[PDB]
């Protein structure tokens, strides 16, 4: 059901915003920047520091165990993000 997220400050046309969607084939990132690349508990960590959007993740077959998330990617989006939404 969960596919991706939108990141931005106003989510309008006046301010630049980020967009991440995981399609059944690939994952598409767009902002001045585009990027494309490749029950179950999916855990993710998103950070925005120094113009870098960093994404860590982990997959597991809230539970009461310990699991460490491995990094996925840094993107030089260069936009301040204050809000986000999950894309159903």
């Amino acid at each position: 059901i969960i596919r991706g997220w939108i990141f931005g400050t106003t989510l309008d046309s006046k301010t630049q915003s980020l967009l991440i969607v995981n399609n059944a084939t690939n994952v598409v990132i767009k902002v001045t920047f585009e990027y494309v690349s490749q029950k179950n508990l999916r855990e993710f960590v998103f950070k925005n520091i120094d113009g870098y959007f960093k994404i860590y993740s982990k997959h597991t077959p809230l539970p009461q165990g310990f699991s460490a998330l491995e990094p996925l990617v840094d993107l030089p989006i260069g936009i301040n993000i204050t809000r986000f939404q999950t894309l159903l």
Binding site: K14, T15, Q16, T32, D50, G51, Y52, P76, G78, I79, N80
Partner: protein, 33 residues
């Protein structure tokens, strides 16, 4: 210095800059509003 690359005898208008803003930018943050 790019004088014989960009100097114009009339005034170039291809290079703009933000002269007013609410608050100073964060490092490596772009604002194209």
């Amino acid at each position: 210095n790019s004088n014989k690359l960009d100097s114009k005898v009339s005034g170039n208008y291809n290079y703009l800059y933000r002269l007013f803003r609410k608050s100073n930018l964060k490092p490596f943050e772009r604002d194209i509003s």
